[PDB]
Every structure is written in structure tokens, then in C-alpha cells.
A paper describes a structure:
Pathogenesis in prion disease involves refolding of the host protein, PrP, from the monomeric, primarily α-helical cellular form (PrPC) to a β-sheet enriched, aggregated infectious form (PrPSc). Additionally we found that rabbits, a species with low susceptibility to prion disease possess PrP with a helix-capping motif in the β2−α2 loop, which appears to hamper the formation of the β-state. In the previously determined structure of wild-type rabbit PrPC 121–230, the sidechain of S174 forms a hydrogen bond with the backbone of N171 and vice versa, creating a hydrophobic staple helix cap motif. To test this hypothesis, we introduced the single mutations S170N and S174N as well as the double mutation S170N/S174N into rabbit PrPC 121–230, successively changing the rabbit sequence in the β2−α2 loop to that of wild-type hamster PrPC.
Author numbering: 126 to 223
């Protein structure tokens, strides 16, 4: 806070180049966020800087919420999470800017 919280979306279809990650995302898809936290779009000059912050904030919040419940993410989870959140952040930027 005060961060903006976007609407829940369907978790994106992503073809990971790493075949094991690709399978892992599908197997464990519900572990990952389906909404992103961000600072308002109009505070940014470009998509890249927005997404950078959106990814950091969203990953921080999801990891914090998870750890305090006594659950864990694997190294593979984190890699997949960063990519999933990146895509949702890009979608959020393009949408909210439109
Ligand atoms: Cl979903
Ligand atoms: Na591959």
C-alpha cells in the first residue's frame, strides 16, 4: 500500500523454453498469482519500468503471503512465478493505459 491491485485474470498460457519448467508450470499452476500489484500506470514513462516494479511488488507480496502461512516456494516456482507475473504485468500495463 498504497499499491493498486488489478483484477484477477486467467493464468497465462506460456511456452517455457525449458521443457521441465514448461511441465512444472502446468502441474503447479495454481501456486502462482492470478493478479498483479502495481503503482499507477501514469507514474511511468515506459512499459519496461512499469513491469519491473510490478513484478517486484507482486512477487514480494505473494512470497510474503505464502511464507507466513507456513508454505514454501521452490527455486523452480520462483523462476516460473517471475515469468507469469511479467506477462500479467505487461497485460495490465497495456490494458490500463488503454
Ligand atoms: Cl487460472
Ligand atoms: Na527446451
Amino acid at each position: 500500500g498504497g499499491y493498486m491491485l488489478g483484477s484477477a485474470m486467467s493464468r497465462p498460457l506460456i511456452h517455457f523454453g525449458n521443457d521441465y519448467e514448461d511441465r512444472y508450470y502446468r502441474e503447479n499452476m495454481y501456486r502462482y498469482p492470478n493478479q498483479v500489484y502495481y503503482r499507477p500506470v501514469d507514474q511511468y514513462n515506459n512499459q519496461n519500468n512499469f513491469v519491473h516494479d510490478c513484478v517486484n511488488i507482486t512477487v514480494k507480496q505473494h512470497t510474503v503471503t505464502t511464507t507466513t502461512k507456513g508454505e514454501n516456494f521452490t527455486e523452480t516456482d520462483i523462476k516460473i512465478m517471475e515469468r507469469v507475473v511479467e506477462q500479467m504485468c505487461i497485460t495490465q500495463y497495456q490494458q490500463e493505459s488503454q
